Amino acid sequence: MLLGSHVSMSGKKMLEGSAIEAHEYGETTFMIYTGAPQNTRRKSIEDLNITKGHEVMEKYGLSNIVVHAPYIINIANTTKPETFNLGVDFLQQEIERTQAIGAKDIVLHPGAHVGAGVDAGINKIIEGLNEVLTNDNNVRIALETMAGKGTEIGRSFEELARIIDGVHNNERLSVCFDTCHTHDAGYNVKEDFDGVLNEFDKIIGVDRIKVVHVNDSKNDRGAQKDRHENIGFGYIGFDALNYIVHHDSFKDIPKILETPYVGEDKKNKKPPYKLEIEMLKQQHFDPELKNKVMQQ
């Protein structure tokens, strides 16, 4: 079972710390940002501490790890050229970092059209990806399914297919399927997950899903709000998320929790991943999970 979470990529230990943390939570894979998720500031490849990170991954049975690009990348931005240019430059550097880390995919939010409209934004993403994937290398960009909050592009499989169709080196594209995002966009992942996969197979191809993000939602189907919830405590629920986690279509695809920390206040937030993974491995919902996460 290839199941883990977002983990830290910080401090002196960098990737070694990621691997230690993933093992702490009983993971077999994990996802990192290559630095702060909120910016493009990054340490040198040497300071990512990759050789030691790989040694700890080998010791603890961690494989198939994932990189996520910072959430501030917006290569759909048609009216702020410094933002577009920074996104292109950053992603070229991220591909080099990711090759060194040994992840197959960089998860990328396609972007936000910020009032220029979907057509202009998709054309801009295509332009940016054509700049980024010009260089040869096998790391893929995994376009994330998005909730459709604000001016996000990627709320439908059709929007993702338009980007894939426009990019020249489109073999270097994959998809990251996020259960919260697809639910919030309106896909019936709770009660018709196989129907959602069949729609995905028609439009894109399920073989292109190279990362799965496993998140419940604080909102009902179609709400377009993108507020993650702990596994089984939201509007998708345990049975549906457990079904997705164990689904044969995803057997050799890393599954990554991005669920919220639990705490009595923001100074006491604790990670839920260890207990969520235990629950998913047992295939039995634990109503006490939030109470127990706070007690860790």
- Please, what is the minimum distance in Å from the beta carbon of residue 226 to Zn ion? 4
Q: Verify binding: residue 226, Fe ion, rule CB under 5 A.
A: no
Q: Which among 121, 99, 110 has a CA at the least distance from the CA of 145?
A: 110
Residues 6+ positions from 194 with CB-CB distance below 8 Å: none
Q: Check the annotation: does 229 bind a ligand.
A: no
Structure tokens at 143: 């376009």
Q: Which residues pair with 173 in a beta bridge?
A: 141
Structure tokens at 235: 């509007």
| Residue 159 binding result from Zn ion, Fe ion, none, given CB thresholds of 5 to 8 Å by partner type | none
Q: Check the annotation: does 113 bind a ligand.
A: no
- Please, what is the minimum distance in Å from the beta carbon of residue 186 to Fe ion? 17
Q: Could you give the CA distance from residue 284 to residue 120 in angstroms, rounded to a whole number?
A: 46
Residues 177-216: x/- map of binding to Zn ion (CB under 5 A)?
----------------------------------------
Q: Verify binding: residue 104, Fe ion, rule CB under 5 A.
A: no
Q: Which stretch binds Zn ion (CB under 5 A): 166-174, 220-228, 266-274, 284-292?
A: 220-228
Q: Which stretch binds Zn ion (CB under 5 A): 29-37, 49-57, 86-94, 219-227?
A: 219-227
Q: Check the annotation: does 144 bind a ligand.
A: yes
Q: Verify binding: residue 226, Zn ion, rule CB under 5 A.
A: yes
Residue 221 CA, distance from chain mean position: 20
Residues 6+ positions from 53 with CB-CB distance below 8 Å: 14, 15, 16, 18, 19, 101
- Please, what is the minimum distance in Å from the beta carbon of residue 224 to Fe ion? 15
Half-sphere exposure of 68 (CA within 13 A, CB side): 26
Q: Verify binding: residue 178, Fe ion, rule CB under 5 A.
A: yes
Given a contact cutoff of 8 angstroms between Cβ atoms, the answer to whether 107 and 211 are in contact is yes
Nearer to Fe ion, 190 or 213 (CB): 213
Q: Verify binding: residue 155, Fe ion, rule CB under 5 A.
A: no
| Residue 286 binding result from Fe ion, Zn ion, none, given CB thresholds of 5 to 8 Å by partner type | none
Residue 292 CA, distance from chain mean position: 26
Q: Check the annotation: does 68 bind a ligand.
A: yes
Which of helix, strand or coil describes residue 214? strand
Please give the residue ranges that form the binding site for Zn ion (CB under 5 A).
Answer: 226
Which residue ranges make up the site for Fe ion (CB under 5 A)? Answer: 144, 178, 213, 258
